[PDB]
Design a protein around this nucleic acid. Structure first.
Ligand SMILES: [Mg+2]
Ligand SMILES: [Mg+2]
Ligand SMILES: [Mg+2]
Ligand SMILES: [Mg+2]
Ligand SMILES: [Mg+2]
Ligand SMILES: [Mg+2]
Ligand SMILES: [Mg+2]
Ligand SMILES: [Mg+2]
Ligand SMILES: [Mg+2]
Ligand SMILES: [Mg+2]
Ligand SMILES: [Mg+2]
Ligand SMILES: [Mg+2]
Ligand SMILES: [Mg+2]
Ligand SMILES: [Mg+2]
Ligand SMILES: [Mg+2]
Ligand SMILES: [Mg+2]
Ligand SMILES: [Mg+2]
Ligand SMILES: [Mg+2]
Ligand SMILES: [Mg+2]
Ligand SMILES: [Mg+2]
Ligand SMILES: [Mg+2]
Ligand SMILES: [Mg+2]
Ligand SMILES: [Mg+2]
Ligand SMILES: [Mg+2]
Ligand SMILES: [Mg+2]
Ligand SMILES: [Mg+2]
Ligand SMILES: [Mg+2]
Ligand SMILES: [Mg+2]
Ligand SMILES: [Mg+2]
Ligand SMILES: [Mg+2]
Ligand SMILES: [Mg+2]
Ligand SMILES: [Mg+2]
Ligand SMILES: [Mg+2]
Ligand SMILES: [Mg+2]
Ligand SMILES: [Mg+2]
Ligand SMILES: [Mg+2]
Ligand SMILES: [Mg+2]
Ligand SMILES: [Mg+2]
Ligand SMILES: [Mg+2]
Ligand SMILES: [Mg+2]
Ligand SMILES: [Mg+2]
Ligand SMILES: [Mg+2]
Ligand SMILES: [Mg+2]
Ligand SMILES: [Mg+2]
Ligand SMILES: [Mg+2]
Ligand SMILES: [Mg+2]
Ligand SMILES: [Mg+2]
Ligand SMILES: [Mg+2]
Ligand SMILES: [Mg+2]
Ligand SMILES: [Mg+2]
Ligand SMILES: [Mg+2]
Ligand SMILES: [Mg+2]
Ligand SMILES: [Mg+2]
Ligand SMILES: [Mg+2]
Ligand SMILES: [Mg+2]
Ligand SMILES: [Mg+2]
Ligand SMILES: [Mg+2]
Ligand SMILES: [Mg+2]
Ligand SMILES: [Mg+2]
Ligand SMILES: [Mg+2]
Ligand SMILES: [Mg+2]
Ligand SMILES: [Mg+2]
Ligand SMILES: [Mg+2]
Ligand SMILES: [Mg+2]
Ligand SMILES: [Mg+2]
Ligand SMILES: [Mg+2]
Ligand SMILES: [Mg+2]
Ligand SMILES: [Mg+2]
Ligand SMILES: [Mg+2]
Ligand SMILES: [Mg+2]
Ligand SMILES: [Mg+2]
Ligand SMILES: [Mg+2]
Ligand SMILES: [Mg+2]
Ligand SMILES: [Mg+2]
Ligand SMILES: [Mg+2]
Ligand SMILES: [Mg+2]
Ligand SMILES: [Mg+2]
Ligand SMILES: [Mg+2]
Ligand SMILES: [Mg+2]
Ligand SMILES: [Mg+2]
Ligand SMILES: [Mg+2]
Ligand SMILES: [Mg+2]
Ligand SMILES: [Mg+2]
Ligand SMILES: [Mg+2]
Ligand SMILES: [Mg+2]
Ligand SMILES: [Mg+2]
Ligand SMILES: [Mg+2]
Ligand SMILES: [Mg+2]
Ligand SMILES: [Mg+2]
Ligand SMILES: [Mg+2]
Ligand SMILES: [Mg+2]
Ligand SMILES: [Mg+2]
Ligand SMILES: [Mg+2]
Ligand SMILES: [Mg+2]
Ligand SMILES: [Mg+2]
Ligand SMILES: [Mg+2]
Ligand SMILES: [Mg+2]
Ligand SMILES: [Mg+2]
Ligand SMILES: [Mg+2]
Ligand SMILES: [Mg+2]
Ligand SMILES: [Mg+2]
Ligand SMILES: [Mg+2]
Ligand SMILES: [Mg+2]
Ligand SMILES: [Mg+2]
Ligand SMILES: [Mg+2]
Ligand SMILES: [Mg+2]
Ligand SMILES: [Mg+2]
Ligand SMILES: [Mg+2]
Ligand SMILES: [Mg+2]
Ligand SMILES: [Mg+2]
Ligand SMILES: [Mg+2]
Ligand SMILES: [Mg+2]
Ligand SMILES: [Mg+2]
Ligand SMILES: [Mg+2]
Ligand SMILES: [Mg+2]
Ligand SMILES: [Mg+2]
Ligand SMILES: [Mg+2]
Ligand SMILES: [Mg+2]
Ligand SMILES: [Mg+2]
Ligand SMILES: [Mg+2]
Ligand SMILES: [Mg+2]
Ligand SMILES: [Mg+2]
Ligand SMILES: [Mg+2]
Ligand SMILES: [Mg+2]
Ligand SMILES: [Mg+2]
Ligand SMILES: [Mg+2]
Ligand SMILES: [Mg+2]
Ligand SMILES: [Mg+2]
Ligand SMILES: [Mg+2]
Ligand SMILES: [Mg+2]
Ligand SMILES: [Mg+2]
Ligand SMILES: [Mg+2]
Ligand SMILES: [Mg+2]
Ligand SMILES: [Mg+2]
Ligand SMILES: [Mg+2]
Ligand SMILES: [Mg+2]
Ligand SMILES: [Mg+2]
Ligand SMILES: [Mg+2]
Ligand SMILES: [Mg+2]
Ligand SMILES: [Mg+2]
Ligand SMILES: [Mg+2]
Ligand SMILES: [Mg+2]
Ligand SMILES: [Mg+2]
Ligand SMILES: [Mg+2]
Ligand SMILES: [Mg+2]
Ligand SMILES: [Mg+2]
Ligand SMILES: [Mg+2]
Ligand SMILES: [Mg+2]
Ligand SMILES: [Mg+2]
Ligand SMILES: [Mg+2]
Ligand SMILES: [Mg+2]
Ligand SMILES: [Mg+2]
Ligand SMILES: [Mg+2]
Ligand SMILES: [Mg+2]
Ligand SMILES: [Mg+2]
Ligand SMILES: [Mg+2]
Ligand SMILES: [Mg+2]
Ligand SMILES: [Mg+2]
Ligand SMILES: [Mg+2]
Ligand SMILES: [Mg+2]
Ligand SMILES: [Mg+2]
Ligand SMILES: [Mg+2]
Ligand SMILES: [Mg+2]
Ligand SMILES: [Mg+2]
Ligand SMILES: [Mg+2]
Ligand SMILES: [Mg+2]
Ligand SMILES: [Mg+2]
Ligand SMILES: [Mg+2]
Ligand SMILES: [Mg+2]
Ligand SMILES: [Mg+2]
Ligand SMILES: [Mg+2]
Ligand SMILES: [Mg+2]
Ligand SMILES: [Mg+2]
Ligand SMILES: [Mg+2]
Ligand SMILES: [Mg+2]
Ligand SMILES: [Mg+2]
Ligand SMILES: [Mg+2]
Ligand SMILES: [Mg+2]
Ligand SMILES: [Mg+2]
Ligand SMILES: [Mg+2]
Ligand SMILES: [Mg+2]
Ligand SMILES: [Mg+2]
Ligand SMILES: [Mg+2]
Ligand SMILES: [Mg+2]
Ligand SMILES: [Mg+2]
Ligand SMILES: [Mg+2]
Ligand SMILES: [Mg+2]
Ligand SMILES: [Mg+2]
Ligand SMILES: [Mg+2]
Ligand SMILES: [Mg+2]
Ligand SMILES: [Mg+2]
Ligand SMILES: [Mg+2]
Ligand SMILES: [Mg+2]
Ligand SMILES: [Mg+2]
Ligand SMILES: [Mg+2]
Ligand SMILES: [Mg+2]
Ligand SMILES: [Mg+2]
Ligand SMILES: [Mg+2]
Ligand SMILES: [Mg+2]
Ligand SMILES: [Mg+2]
Ligand SMILES: [Mg+2]
Ligand SMILES: [Mg+2]
Ligand SMILES: [Mg+2]
Ligand SMILES: [Mg+2]
Ligand SMILES: [Mg+2]
Ligand SMILES: [Mg+2]
Ligand SMILES: [Mg+2]
Ligand SMILES: [Mg+2]
Ligand SMILES: [Mg+2]
Ligand SMILES: [Mg+2]
Ligand SMILES: [Mg+2]
Ligand SMILES: [Mg+2]
Ligand SMILES: [Mg+2]
Ligand SMILES: [Mg+2]
Ligand SMILES: [Mg+2]
Ligand SMILES: [Mg+2]
Ligand SMILES: [Mg+2]
Ligand SMILES: [Mg+2]
Ligand SMILES: [Mg+2]
Ligand SMILES: [Mg+2]
Ligand SMILES: [Mg+2]
Ligand SMILES: [Mg+2]
Ligand SMILES: [Mg+2]
Ligand SMILES: [Mg+2]
Ligand SMILES: [Mg+2]
Ligand SMILES: [Mg+2]
Ligand SMILES: [Mg+2]
Ligand SMILES: [Mg+2]
Ligand SMILES: [Mg+2]
Ligand SMILES: [Mg+2]
Ligand SMILES: [Mg+2]
Ligand SMILES: [Mg+2]
Ligand SMILES: [Mg+2]
Ligand SMILES: [Mg+2]
Ligand SMILES: [Mg+2]
Ligand SMILES: [Mg+2]
Ligand SMILES: [Mg+2]
Ligand SMILES: [Mg+2]
Ligand SMILES: [Mg+2]
Ligand SMILES: [Mg+2]
Ligand SMILES: [Mg+2]
Ligand SMILES: [Mg+2]
Ligand SMILES: [Mg+2]
Ligand SMILES: [Mg+2]
Ligand SMILES: [Mg+2]
Ligand SMILES: [Mg+2]
Ligand SMILES: [Mg+2]
Ligand SMILES: [Mg+2]
Ligand SMILES: [Mg+2]
Ligand SMILES: [Mg+2]
Ligand SMILES: [Mg+2]
Ligand SMILES: [Mg+2]
Ligand SMILES: [Mg+2]
Ligand SMILES: [Mg+2]
Ligand SMILES: [Mg+2]
Ligand SMILES: [Mg+2]
Ligand SMILES: [Mg+2]
Ligand SMILES: [Mg+2]
Ligand SMILES: [Mg+2]
Ligand SMILES: [Mg+2]
Ligand SMILES: [Mg+2]
Ligand SMILES: [Mg+2]
Ligand SMILES: [Mg+2]
Ligand SMILES: [Mg+2]
Ligand SMILES: [Mg+2]
Ligand SMILES: [Mg+2]
Ligand SMILES: [Mg+2]
Ligand SMILES: [Mg+2]
Ligand SMILES: [Mg+2]
Ligand SMILES: [Mg+2]
Ligand SMILES: [Mg+2]
Ligand SMILES: [Mg+2]
Ligand SMILES: [Mg+2]
Ligand SMILES: [Mg+2]
Ligand SMILES: [Mg+2]
Ligand SMILES: [Mg+2]
Ligand SMILES: [Mg+2]
Ligand SMILES: [Mg+2]
Ligand SMILES: [Mg+2]
Ligand SMILES: [Mg+2]
Ligand SMILES: [Mg+2]
Ligand SMILES: [Mg+2]
Ligand SMILES: [Mg+2]
Ligand SMILES: [Mg+2]
Ligand SMILES: [Mg+2]
Ligand SMILES: [Mg+2]
Ligand SMILES: [Mg+2]
Ligand SMILES: [Mg+2]
Ligand SMILES: [Zn+2]
Lengths: 204, 4, 59, 118, 122, 131
RNA sequence: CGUGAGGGAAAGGUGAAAAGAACCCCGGGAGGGGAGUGAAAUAGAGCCUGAAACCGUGGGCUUACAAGCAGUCACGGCCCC
RNA sequence: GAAUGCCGGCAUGAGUAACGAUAAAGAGGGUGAGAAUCCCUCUCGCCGUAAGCCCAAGGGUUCCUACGCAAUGGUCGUCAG
RNA sequence: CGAUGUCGGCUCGUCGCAUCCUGGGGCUGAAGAAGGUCCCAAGGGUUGGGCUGUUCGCCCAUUAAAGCGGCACGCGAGCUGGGUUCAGAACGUCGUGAGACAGUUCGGUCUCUAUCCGCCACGGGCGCAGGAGGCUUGAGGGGGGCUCUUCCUAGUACGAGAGGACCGGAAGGGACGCACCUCUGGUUUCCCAGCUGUCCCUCCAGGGGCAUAAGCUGGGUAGCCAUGUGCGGAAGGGAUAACCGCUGAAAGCAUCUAAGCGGGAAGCCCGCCCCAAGAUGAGGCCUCCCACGGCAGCCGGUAAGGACCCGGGAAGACCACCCGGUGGAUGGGCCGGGGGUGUAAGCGCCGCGAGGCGUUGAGCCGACCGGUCCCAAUCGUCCGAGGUCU
């Protein structure tokens, strides 16, 4: 179990054996290790990783003390990868080889207040034949006096997207160590410029 | 109601 | 629709409780570095007409 | 949704919003400084900067281009022979927006001045 | 993208001129048939004394579609009509000729006889 | 970071410069690598360029040709490694970037609307006289 | 109110006497603060008395793990006499 | 203390719906205690077999001018039927 | 009965299991394949169409299957209004007649504003004994849970023949779900062009308004998107159901059981994805500030820090969240590129002219990828610990 903190760059398709391969390009490393969670100290096994250098004149005193115990620059982001104790003190794209499968976690695009048709693929109402101002409405939400109420987890309108989403078992198409680049076949959660977490796959 |  | 209607009159307790979020916040004001009058930040002083050091508007 | 959509609507349909920017453009180039609400002011910076820039270029084409918005040859003549030369060495930023301290009485509207730069 | 009610031209000399798809024989509930898929259909127009007549419920395989089909090399192909070739329950053509080009996808799907009778495989 | 440059950096392995320039309205022949069951041969496709949608490495173009009575449109990535070569057959002159309207024209109607582009016919013949 | 026949309200009280508040003050005015009148001005004209619903300001006690026809019985804490 | 009682007063819903044709506005200069809303100028838009003009019914001073802004005006008001 | 709206449909679910399919079994008048009957099993699935207001039912084409019932014959302050169920009209029938008919026929007013509970989302407050900025554990919840075809094993086992496997192993589909915009395909209210009628600038040329809230037409970036793309259902471990056992008495034999031990389901637990310490049982780690001044308390000045304001944001109804604020690339402008459009104006030449040609892939040009302090984020203010008792 191994992982790294990335930046989603954009999408393209390359050619491999006369087939077009859609890809997402990810600027993964380099992530210096800032702290190690041990069973003796914290109760579990993980690496806290840094990512993106930060203006040292922008990082307050509590955080500076934290960076000093590890002797690293200020980094913009701090994220943990659980059950990973890498040997070195820095994690780069070369922990992945082309052909490995990875899971990627980002923050999906946010639709704000979403109707039930966009949120839950509901069918709405008809658009003619008498339909009276219900064209996008959820329909009925219950029964009658029994149970006289509405189920918890009922599918209704409300905020949608901008939620943590992991897509699983994506093939690593190429690794470019010189640019900290990681290629991955298919679609990755979130917008270009969004932070993403890349982990070795869990599907066997 | 038209209960007829 | 069928004209939904208040079932019970709201008590003085509940009506006032609903208003616990109605108080106004006082305006954000800072002194003007030229004439020392209390004015909103990021606006030309309305008492001496200065902003960002220099005179800008007649007052 | 509105992800990455540039520009304001100002509760005006398409022909009315365009005429709004043109009239504000005529009055700003005419008086050097005007007062509007803050949202209108912010959107006026770009519409006017562009005409002023084409007035720096100075060709017949530029002049015909500006006249599609401004319509008044005297005002265009003034923009070409007096306004424009003031900005030969300036690369953008020909206008400035400053906010005023008090709101209009009848509807609360926050106001701002919009002016040509020295 | 052929579904029930869709009309298809007949790219053979069977006698049928137009057929109306009534079923997509691909699973319990395929919404759409494409190139290389088999439908059930009703013969809506025929030429006289052909092997098939109007009102026959027949089988056919779609050989051309107006919705463009995509390909693993990143390319695509699109025809002007929607056309099919009438088959028997062994996927073999029930007529002796095949008119117009057909897609290369038919080869992979095992309709080799139609492919060879075709004047151009695209 | 410059995100746009990195995509351009990923794409540089696969960009081509051997292919000759053409325009919507030109008649073009694409010698295309095809796989037929077992073997792989070369199938030429010749017709009128009707659309070029640009996006750098991801630009594509669309060719339209009549074949045994049926119209066939065929979309090609411009930097596809399956394209062996592209050969100009005729320069035509359009008045707009997309030629969808010719799908509804007769053969004579098309001829009259996409006339030979003598200016670029000359530029081709002027070059190729290289020595 | 009704075309019309016709229907058909609400609304009383300063003080013994106007002595009905000159003049100054903030205020565009309204209104108020003083001064003055009066035995009395929360009798000041929106005027005798001035109940109740209802609204507000100040203080005592109390309330953010808690289940209620809202009370009652008991004990304890705090405040007041 | 109850009559969906009668007359009057005041609550709740609530700072909520709404503020009456989607023909449309912007700026400058005046006036004034106070101006998106009154007056003046320039720009913009809308009607033009009318959303312009003249009669007749009906209405009955609403006409013109000066001075006004408590109420009337669905906001404001220095304007006004 | 001072009113509990009444059929069917649509939408939206949820539950029962007497199970329609898929999983596991025993018996068989089970050779194989395929069935019949019964047992276990409610996780998921259970299609499209013709007719009728229909429920139901028949029919067409499929399918693994086209299950049956409950929730006020689930659901009209959610929709419909075909039927039923007023007033009009007519037919058959009945009545002398006025009229009558779960008989038929054509038509027929279904009410903008949610107070409390409940539900979907989002904040404010206080709490978590000092106060802070980060990073986390996962009690406990939620999501998901489908399935077919072909091939190899092997034309083998089995069977006269027809036909035709178990076990094991590959490939490829359907429907569903989450995310995404490189491709395919939409939109793209002013990004470019072309066209008409009219009025106007300024007469030609060149333009502007209006013809919709784009006048019309041909195109179209980014974004938002499906028809497009990637990925998911598992694997695996554990305990079980029906069922099958090992050993084994009571009962010298027998017995899956009384002592003990195995095997065994798409189901149960965990494993995967997501929320989560208001988990008041309020958790843990790293780091920062600290004993300040006046009669578990008190009021002021500070601390680490936070808020206020402002420039913005694929974040968003407001709020929240995230980034930046001159030691700055946060928006606007400008420049370079991408992209759209498809060769501007003007001049020169050819033509009587409409036009044509060259200058020229020009000119214009939203959002995309970057650069550049030209313009604007000026100047500041206000909160904010001295840590209770054994
Ligand atoms: Mg993009
Ligand atoms: Mg490769
Ligand atoms: Mg993240
Ligand atoms: Mg997001
Ligand atoms: Mg998305
Ligand atoms: Mg949004
Ligand atoms: Mg909806
Ligand atoms: Mg959805
Ligand atoms: Mg969704
Ligand atoms: Mg949808
Ligand atoms: Mg629907
Ligand atoms: Mg529907
Ligand atoms: Mg719909
Ligand atoms: Mg509609
Ligand atoms: Mg209706
Ligand atoms: Mg209606
Ligand atoms: Mg409705
Ligand atoms: Mg409607
Ligand atoms: Mg009910
Ligand atoms: Mg009901
Ligand atoms: Mg209940
Ligand atoms: Mg959110
Ligand atoms: Mg998700
Ligand atoms: Mg796979
Ligand atoms: Mg992301
Ligand atoms: Mg970020
Ligand atoms: Mg209703
Ligand atoms: Mg309704
Ligand atoms: Mg209604
Ligand atoms: Mg109502
Ligand atoms: Mg009641
Ligand atoms: Mg109420
Ligand atoms: Mg009450
Ligand atoms: Mg009370
Ligand atoms: Mg109160
Ligand atoms: Mg309340
Ligand atoms: Mg409120
Ligand atoms: Mg306050
Ligand atoms: Mg939306
Ligand atoms: Mg919208
Ligand atoms: Mg932007
Ligand atoms: Mg609006
Ligand atoms: Mg509006
Ligand atoms: Mg408006
Ligand atoms: Mg508004
Ligand atoms: Mg218009
Ligand atoms: Mg102004
Ligand atoms: Mg304005
Ligand atoms: Mg611009
Ligand atoms: Mg000139
Ligand atoms: Mg300012
Ligand atoms: Mg302000
Ligand atoms: Mg006012
Ligand atoms: Mg007002
Ligand atoms: Mg034919
Ligand atoms: Mg044919
Ligand atoms: Mg025949
Ligand atoms: Mg017939
Ligand atoms: Mg017939
Ligand atoms: Mg055939
Ligand atoms: Mg052949
Ligand atoms: Mg880089
Ligand atoms: Mg890009
Ligand atoms: Mg041709
Ligand atoms: Mg021509
Ligand atoms: Mg022509
Ligand atoms: Mg030419
Ligand atoms: Mg009257
Ligand atoms: Mg009457
Ligand atoms: Mg009268
Ligand atoms: Mg009467
Ligand atoms: Mg009295
Ligand atoms: Mg008296
Ligand atoms: Mg007396
Ligand atoms: Mg006086
Ligand atoms: Mg005085
Ligand atoms: Mg005064
Ligand atoms: Mg005074
Ligand atoms: Mg006055
Ligand atoms: Mg007075
Ligand atoms: Mg006073
Ligand atoms: Mg007084
Ligand atoms: Mg006295
Ligand atoms: Mg007094
Ligand atoms: Mg008294
Ligand atoms: Mg008294
Ligand atoms: Mg008395
Ligand atoms: Mg009194
Ligand atoms: Mg009183
Ligand atoms: Mg009183
Ligand atoms: Mg009282
Ligand atoms: Mg009070
Ligand atoms: Mg009080
Ligand atoms: Mg108090
Ligand atoms: Mg209590
Ligand atoms: Mg508890
Ligand atoms: Mg408590
Ligand atoms: Mg309680
Ligand atoms: Mg009681
Ligand atoms: Mg009690
Ligand atoms: Mg006791
Ligand atoms: Mg009584
Ligand atoms: Mg009553
Ligand atoms: Mg009564
Ligand atoms: Mg009473
Ligand atoms: Mg009464
Ligand atoms: Mg009354
Ligand atoms: Mg009353
Ligand atoms: Mg009274
Ligand atoms: Mg009353
Ligand atoms: Mg009252
Ligand atoms: Mg009350
Ligand atoms: Mg009230
Ligand atoms: Mg009231
Ligand atoms: Mg109120
Ligand atoms: Mg409000
Ligand atoms: Mg309001
Ligand atoms: Mg409300
Ligand atoms: Mg509201
Ligand atoms: Mg209302
Ligand atoms: Mg409103
Ligand atoms: Mg109204
Ligand atoms: Mg109005
Ligand atoms: Mg109208
Ligand atoms: Mg209005
Ligand atoms: Mg009109
Ligand atoms: Mg119009
Ligand atoms: Mg203007
Ligand atoms: Mg204005
Ligand atoms: Mg004005
Ligand atoms: Mg003004
Ligand atoms: Mg002035
Ligand atoms: Mg005003
Ligand atoms: Mg005023
Ligand atoms: Mg107005
Ligand atoms: Mg005026
Ligand atoms: Mg002007
Ligand atoms: Mg006329
Ligand atoms: Mg006329
Ligand atoms: Mg009108
Ligand atoms: Mg009158
Ligand atoms: Mg009068
Ligand atoms: Mg008044
Ligand atoms: Mg007034
Ligand atoms: Mg007033
Ligand atoms: Mg008066
Ligand atoms: Mg009034
Ligand atoms: Mg008023
Ligand atoms: Mg009114
Ligand atoms: Mg005045
Ligand atoms: Mg008058
Ligand atoms: Mg009843
Ligand atoms: Mg009642
Ligand atoms: Mg009742
Ligand atoms: Mg009822
Ligand atoms: Mg009732
Ligand atoms: Mg009721
Ligand atoms: Mg429907
Ligand atoms: Mg059900
Ligand atoms: Mg059972
Ligand atoms: Mg079974
Ligand atoms: Mg079974
Ligand atoms: Mg047998
Ligand atoms: Mg068998
Ligand atoms: Mg069996
Ligand atoms: Mg059994
Ligand atoms: Mg089940
Ligand atoms: Mg079921
Ligand atoms: Mg039909
Ligand atoms: Mg039907
Ligand atoms: Mg039926
Ligand atoms: Mg029924
Ligand atoms: Mg029936
Ligand atoms: Mg079967
Ligand atoms: Mg069956
Ligand atoms: Mg059915
Ligand atoms: Mg049922
Ligand atoms: Mg059912
Ligand atoms: Mg029941
Ligand atoms: Mg029943
Ligand atoms: Mg019944
Ligand atoms: Mg029902
Ligand atoms: Mg119902
Ligand atoms: Mg209804
Ligand atoms: Mg109903
Ligand atoms: Mg209901
Ligand atoms: Mg109801
Ligand atoms: Mg309801
Ligand atoms: Mg109800
Ligand atoms: Mg609804
Ligand atoms: Mg009806
Ligand atoms: Mg019937
Ligand atoms: Mg009769
Ligand atoms: Mg009789
Ligand atoms: Mg008789
Ligand atoms: Mg008779
Ligand atoms: Mg009847
Ligand atoms: Mg009946
Ligand atoms: Mg009856
Ligand atoms: Mg009958
Ligand atoms: Mg009937
Ligand atoms: Mg009848
Ligand atoms: Mg009827
Ligand atoms: Mg009718
Ligand atoms: Mg009806
Ligand atoms: Mg309504
Ligand atoms: Mg409510
Ligand atoms: Mg509602
Ligand atoms: Mg309640
Ligand atoms: Mg509530
Ligand atoms: Mg909270
Ligand atoms: Mg704590
Ligand atoms: Mg703490
Ligand atoms: Mg913290
Ligand atoms: Mg722990
Ligand atoms: Mg965690
Ligand atoms: Mg758990
Ligand atoms: Mg709980
Ligand atoms: Mg499952
Ligand atoms: Mg074999
Ligand atoms: Mg064997
Ligand atoms: Mg055989
Ligand atoms: Mg198998
Ligand atoms: Mg499902
Ligand atoms: Mg989705
Ligand atoms: Mg997306
Ligand atoms: Mg794109
Ligand atoms: Mg696209
Ligand atoms: Mg496209
Ligand atoms: Mg615009
Ligand atoms: Mg334009
Ligand atoms: Mg024109
Ligand atoms: Mg003139
Ligand atoms: Mg002209
Ligand atoms: Mg021209
Ligand atoms: Mg006009
Ligand atoms: Mg007009
Ligand atoms: Mg139209
Ligand atoms: Mg236009
Ligand atoms: Mg298009
Ligand atoms: Mg268009
Ligand atoms: Mg686009
Ligand atoms: Mg695009
Ligand atoms: Mg796009
Ligand atoms: Mg999207
Ligand atoms: Mg799709
Ligand atoms: Mg045995
Ligand atoms: Mg034994
Ligand atoms: Mg024994
Ligand atoms: Mg035992
Ligand atoms: Mg066992
Ligand atoms: Mg086991
Ligand atoms: Mg499974
Ligand atoms: Mg979490
Ligand atoms: Mg906590
Ligand atoms: Mg947590
Ligand atoms: Mg506690
Ligand atoms: Mg506690
Ligand atoms: Mg505790
Ligand atoms: Mg508990
Ligand atoms: Mg804690
Ligand atoms: Mg916000
Ligand atoms: Mg905002
Ligand atoms: Mg707000
Ligand atoms: Mg906001
Ligand atoms: Mg605020
Ligand atoms: Mg925060
Ligand atoms: Mg943060
Ligand atoms: Mg900040
Ligand atoms: Mg600052
Ligand atoms: Mg800062
Ligand atoms: Mg910047
Ligand atoms: Mg940057
Ligand atoms: Mg910039
Ligand atoms: Mg902006
Ligand atoms: Mg450019
Ligand atoms: Mg370019
Ligand atoms: Mg280009
Ligand atoms: Mg270009
Ligand atoms: Mg040219
Ligand atoms: Mg030219
Ligand atoms: Mg010309
Ligand atoms: Mg000449
Ligand atoms: Mg030409
Ligand atoms: Mg322009
Ligand atoms: Mg430009
Ligand atoms: Mg610099
Ligand atoms: Mg200051
Ligand atoms: Zn000042």
């Amino acid at each position: 179990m191994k992982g790294i903190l990335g930046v989603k760059v954009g999408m393209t398709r390359i050619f491999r054996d006369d087939r077009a391969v859609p890809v997402t390009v990810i600027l993964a490393g380099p992530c210096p290790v800032v702290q190690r969670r041990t069973p003796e100290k914290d109760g579990y096994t993980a690496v806290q990783l840094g990512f993106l250098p930060q203006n040292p004149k922008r990082v307050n005193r509590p955080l500076k003390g934290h960076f000093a115990k590890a002797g690293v620059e200020p980094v913009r982001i701090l994220r943990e990868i659980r059950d990973f104790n890498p040997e070195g003190d820095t994690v780069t794209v070369e922990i992945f080889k082309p052909g490995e499968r990875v899971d990627v976690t980002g923050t999906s695009k946010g639709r704000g207040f979403a109707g039930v048709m966009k949120r839950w693929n509901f069918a709405g109402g008809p658009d003619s034949h008498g339909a009276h101002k219900i064209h996008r409405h959820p329909g009925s939400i219950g029964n009658r006096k029994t149970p006289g109420r509405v189920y918890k987890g009922k599918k209704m309108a409300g905020h949608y997207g901008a939620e943590r989403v992991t897509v699983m078992n994506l093939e690593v198409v190429d690794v470019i160590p010189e640019e900290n680049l990681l290629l991955v076949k298919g679609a990755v959660p979130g917008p270009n410029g969004g932070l993403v977490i890349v982990r070795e796959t869990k599907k066997a | 109601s038209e209960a007829c | 629709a069928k004209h939904p209607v208040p079932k019970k009159k709201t008590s003085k307790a509940r009506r006032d409780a609903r208003r616990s979020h109605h108080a106004l916040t006082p305006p954000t004001l800072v002194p003007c570095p030229e004439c020392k009058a209390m004015k909103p930040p990021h606006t030309v002083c309305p008492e001496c007409g200065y902003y960002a050091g220099r005179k800008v508007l007649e007052v | 949704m509105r992800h990455l959509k540039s520009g304001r609507k100002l509760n005006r349909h398409s022909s009315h919003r365009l005429a709004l920017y043109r009239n504000q453009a005529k009055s700003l180039l005419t008086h050097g400084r005007i007062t509007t609400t803050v949202p209108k002011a912010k959107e006026l910076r770009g519409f006017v900067d562009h005409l002023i820039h084409l007035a720096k270029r100075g060709d017949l084409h530029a002049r015909r281009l500006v006249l599609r918005d401004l319509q008044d040859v005297k005002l265009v003549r003034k923009l070409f022979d007096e306004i424009a030369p003031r900005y030969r060495d300036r690369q953008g930023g020909y206008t400035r927006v400053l906010k005023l301290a008090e709101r209009r009485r009848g509807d609360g509207a926050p106001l701002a001045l919009v002016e040509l730069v020295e | 993208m052929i579904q029930p009610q869709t009309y298809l031209e007949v790219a053979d000399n069977t006698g049928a001129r137009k057929i109306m798809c009534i079923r997509v024989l691909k699973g319990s509930n395929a919404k759409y048939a494409t190139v290389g898929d088999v439908i059930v259909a009703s013969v809506k127009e025929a030429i006289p004394r052909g092997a098939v007549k109007e009102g026959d419920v027949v089988k056919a395989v779609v050989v051309r579609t107006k919705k463009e089909i995509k390909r693993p090399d990143g390319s695509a192909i699109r025809f002007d009509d929607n056309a099919a070739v009438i088959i028997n329950n062994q996927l073999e053509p029930r007529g002796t000729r095949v008119f117009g080009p057909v897609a290369r996808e038919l080869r992979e799907k095992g309709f080799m006889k139609i492919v060879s009778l075709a004047p151009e495989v695209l | 970071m410059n995100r746009g440059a990195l995509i351009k950096l990923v794409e540089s392995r696969y960009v081509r410069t051997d292919l000759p320039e053409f325009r919507p309205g030109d008649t073009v022949r694409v010698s295309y690598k095809v796989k037929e069951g077992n073997r792989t041969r070369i199938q030429d496709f010749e017709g009128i360029v009707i659309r070029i949608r640009r996006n750098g490495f991801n630009t594509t173009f669309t060719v339209r040709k009549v074949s045994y009575g049926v119209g066939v449109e065929r979309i090609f990535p411009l930097h596809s490694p399956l394209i062996q070569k592209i050969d100009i057959v005729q320069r035509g002159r359009a008045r707009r970037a997309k030629l969808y309207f010719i799908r509804n024209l007769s053969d004579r109607e098309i001829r009259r609307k996409l006339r030979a582009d003598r200016k670029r016919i000359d530029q081709d013949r002027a070059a190729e006289r290289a020595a």
